[PDB]
Amino acid sequence: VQLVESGGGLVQPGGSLRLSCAASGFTFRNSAMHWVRQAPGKGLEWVSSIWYSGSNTYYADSVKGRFTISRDNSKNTLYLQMNSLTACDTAVYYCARFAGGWGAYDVWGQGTLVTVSSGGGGSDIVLTQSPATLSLSPGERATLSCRASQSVSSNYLAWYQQKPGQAPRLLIYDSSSRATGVPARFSGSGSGTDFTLTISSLEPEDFAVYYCHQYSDISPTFGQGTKVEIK
Amino acid sequence: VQLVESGGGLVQPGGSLRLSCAASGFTFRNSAMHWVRQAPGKGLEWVSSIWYSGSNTYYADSVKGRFTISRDNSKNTLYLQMNSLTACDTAVYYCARFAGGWGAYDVWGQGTLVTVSSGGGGDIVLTQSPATLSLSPGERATLSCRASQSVSSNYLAWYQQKPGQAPRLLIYDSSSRATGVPARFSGSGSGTDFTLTISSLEPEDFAVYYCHQYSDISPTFGQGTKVEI
């Protein structure tokens, strides 16, 4: 009693793959068959199901409208056609027989890794911001930090303010240049991998989420933000 | 000097939307124009860029091959064609002028929310606890799975997953111990509250354990409990 899985691999975004699952040791034509996936370091996630007949296909929202489940009962084979692949599809995909009240997922394929990426073997510049949250009162000085995983060419680092429900607003660019109209209490500094945004004296309108942003290469990245809230 | 955005909204998985961004107050035809997005509760993420004829358009892997950035310079308008949309595209999308060393993103559109979902206004959420268990051999492990709604027919299963292997069925129908599973594993519970007990732990029991409800047409899993020896 087994499910012999095949397919998968590393594919460019937008691409297509077909997974296969050849069944033996049970009455395939009498069995509902499902796909389940598991993103790296994450939990099991249902993907798709098909009735013994080939009718009544169902799909999780993560794949609906892009993936197609099908079966060939005369070949005891289940398929998952994956189209328009995107980075968030990256995961180990398992086929499974669904026995319902007579066994849940009682037969599993061994799984195959699908990775959707156009990336080289290197890594992007990761920006870490500290602290995650600042509880301050108006009048106090706030010092925000942005730490880059590697050096930032030309000091191409910018800071943005974002209030709830509003677009980001440029504060500082080139690590230290104040954007037009920005009050003088906003000052940025640093070079290389360590950068700092300073608000000399907080006003009530300064409470917001602040983002750092590096634009030194073709893969611009952002920090995850620092929230300045009233204490 | 402004960017006036349009489009967005709620769309079914696999569908398509076009966003647009109409610029005024600067020589748009020569500008480098980007799209940037923000998932709900998350941070900013660059999406796509386009600049003069003679340079490449660029896309992040999150959208490459599905989305198309374009411009109609005679209309001073930037576009984002979003095809085969998926749940992980849900986000507020901003257009922005990129000025590089002269200002990074110095002009932003006001943003528009794109939500990709087939759901109604209500899914059974399974919450496992503890997240982590550290025990020694011979001890007994008690694992818990709480459901946000009653699990019809007690159609609840438990799986064992060892590192790098496929899940293994332990328990189904809340208490049925699967063929070949040792009697020290036992499932109990009913309705919204289920328990997995593991007696006389072995080193081989080191694994992650997931619960699973299959009481409806939208099966869901718990996030798992890791038990180490």
Author numbering:
A (entry chain H): 2 to 124, 201 to 308
B (entry chain G): 2 to 123, 201 to 307
Relevant lines from the article:
Although changing Arg83 to a threonine substantially reduces ambiguity in predicting diabody structures, they remain significantly diverse, which limits their use in designing protein nano-assemblies. In order to reduce this structural flexibility and prevent chain shuffling, we introduced disulfide bridges between the VH1 and VH2 chains in the Fv interface. The sites of the proposed cysteines were designed initially using the “Disulfide by Design” program, with the crystal structure of diabody 6052 as template. In order to examine the structural flexibility of the disulfide-bridged diabodies, we determined the structures of three of them. All were designed by the “Disulfide by Design” program using the crystal structure of the 6052 diabody as template. The three diabodies have practically identical structures regardless of large variations in the crystallization conditions. Some of them were crystallized in a buffer containing a high concentration of salt and organic solvent while others were generated in a buffer containing polyethyleneglycol. The pH of the crystallization solution ranged from 3.5 to 8.5. This demonstrates that the introduction of a disulfide bridge can essentially freeze the structure of a diabody under a wide range of experimental conditions. The disulfide bridges we introduced were located between the Fv domains and can essentially lock-in the relative conformation of the Fv domains in the diabody.
